[PDB]
Write a protein that binds this DNA or RNA. Structure first.
Lengths: 107, 121, 118, 118, 118, 118, 121, 107
DNA sequence: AGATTCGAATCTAGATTCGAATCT
DNA sequence: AGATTCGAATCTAGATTCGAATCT
């Protein structure tokens, strides 16, 4: 479907400018209608990999902070002290070591 | 100056929809060109912003670290919770049971997506 | 760019069959070239993947699997830790951590979060 | 039988690259059609395999969904566990786990981390 | 050379109808352009013909008609002349021009001649 | 609706010629598509008319056939008439219609005439 | 030297048919290329001849003349045959009858191809 | 269907020569296979407008000669002489005149 | 002897773009 | 305002040509 818009000289300049910019970036097939279409699409906008990646990174980061703290408090629990097996000076680097080895599997 | 753009059916619908919406809001003089113009103006404004300003691998790496870290931490926290008197008392958190149960849970879950008998691919 | 491949009768049948299959699935615009392109794309990906394999890593699939495990594991572990925390005298005392409330609340949180993207 | 597929520049490059690679490996008779044929054959095989698998092999979207749930679940659970740990007498005693300090600190951590990539 | 015409819905229907009609008559390769071309060719011919008309002559059709008349006329006339020649005493005398023989002989000649080209 | 027809150079010339002709007749808005449309319309009308006619209007082949028959018939008839005229007493008398002279003369005439064009 | 020609199904059939024909005539060594070669040789020979050497309008004109001439001549011959005593005697060749009959014949014949109610075209 | 013939150098030259000749005559799309095909077609050959036009011209020409002669003899028939209406010095030019007028209708 | 591969190429087919233009 | 004409153009689609080449 084709659209005819009557725009002001400002808008017009900016667009024809964009077309130029593009061709100049190899984007051969850049065109007036071509570019206005992209701009309309963009204007309208104003699942989702990026938005999703973001949420997951937050949740994971959050969980990690929380567990760090929980860990420290568990270590302070009398029953833990008693066992003699949860000395934070040991567990902690052990955990770091685990993470590093794991990461290194893939990087 | 007049612009002729050839857009797809999606875009077109959305716009003609907007024109309708507007007239319906008293905005008498709402029109196709009229509204597209406003939308173009809007799109330009953003485009500029984007102009004036994502690494998978680095991100995959951070996530693997955080997750691995969290897993190590929980393993430890779990062991300590089991040691808590109230846990001992309940008789429901025998590590020798819970622990393999958890391994079992992990395996079944992984196998939903990475059934062993569907390997090589 | 256009490619001309001379394939055997097997391959040919299979593909023309696929075109049929598709149109038959509403996929109107299914075509010979159309489908072969998709198949080439597919074949390349595996070739690459196989390639990447016998070299060093990396390996999306292996990674997706490890993350799913760790995440699943963590989730089982927290479930259990949660239940034990609830049993802690100090928790009982506060009257703010009844499993019969927290638990569904957590379920509720998960659902709303998932529904953001689904 | 001969196939004409109209592929994109990516695919095209990759293939012409493969032809090069091969001749360079002694594979004299390597050719465009030649190689695309082999790639088609390959692509078909996988398509079949996927076809067979189970709802048809791995499923990005279904997997993304599971992971989002597990992670969200875990986060809700930890928030609660955290609150209960803070209530543990030994925690109160240390004076180091004032939930009102820790909490914003955790939020702060999250934000800085996300901002690394976004 | 390719032509792009913007026609009205009437014309369009009629043509797409013709394509249908054709395929339906075995004419496998019938197509839109295909048929429009034939129609253009046809339209030109009439245009020319009409043209040629209001100018001077010439005029295949008018000519074909006049020749068919003259030929037909001649044929009727000869039939009659033949019958009268047969009645001429000198013919009777010769014993070589019995209608019951000549006539079928003539029919025979005509048929063989026609069958050369049909 | 828009039509794309792939025509031959003849047709194409004729049309582009017509466009020229028209503009030259003041018909400002004459155009390629413009004119082809008018020609299509025209072509359709005739096609219809032919359709209606009777076995569908004039028929070259059927006509060629009739003419060949009539002409062949006439020729057989005349050959016979000629032989009988020669037998007429008045002919014998004149000494000018010896069938053995006339006959080759006629053959000779035919040959020279045909050779004008062949 | 070898030639690759892409011919139509007609031509191809005809040739492969010829090969068959030949072998069937003892011509053992008959072959596709074999026979096409012979056919090419043959085609060249003719082509040359044609090389070393039709006007519709002029021809239409000659034919119209001859036919018209023949028609005038027959009209006259007809009139004379009618005058022949033997014709008079038969009572079957009254020009007043034959003549319109002949006109009738012509008209009906023309109308087979140039029905009056199908004019203008 | 494609044919591979192994020809001698003579034939080959003649053909490649023909291809050249043609291109040189504007016949852009002239080609080896292209031309050999035409030559095969031709070789094999060794209704029909031309053949038909020929036969019709013969028959008509023949008929015309014959009628001329028949005409002359009819004129000699006593009954014709008697009528006084078939004087060859009159009829004949009359016939010529008819033919000319008829031809002139179309040329 | 002819099957078959190969890739540059040309063509009819028709969907779709583009922007200049005229008339609402 | 937007309908519509116009013709240059580009693209996917697949049939068909061409001749150089290798293997029967």
């Amino acid at each position: 479907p084709k659209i005819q818009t009557y725009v002001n000289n400002n808008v017009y300049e900016q667009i024809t400018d964009l077309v130029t910019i593009r061709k100049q970036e190899g984007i051969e097939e850049a065109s007036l209608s071509n570019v206005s279409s992209m701009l309309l699409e963009l204007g309208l906008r104003v699942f989702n990999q990026m938005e999703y990646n973001k949420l997951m990174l937050e949740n994971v980061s959050r969980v990690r902070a929380m567990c760090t703290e929980i860990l420290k408090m568990s270590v302070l629990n009398q029953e833990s002290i008693a066992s003699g097996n949860f000395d934070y000076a040991v567990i902690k680097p052990a955990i770091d070591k685990f993470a590093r080895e794991q990461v290194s599997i893939f990087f």
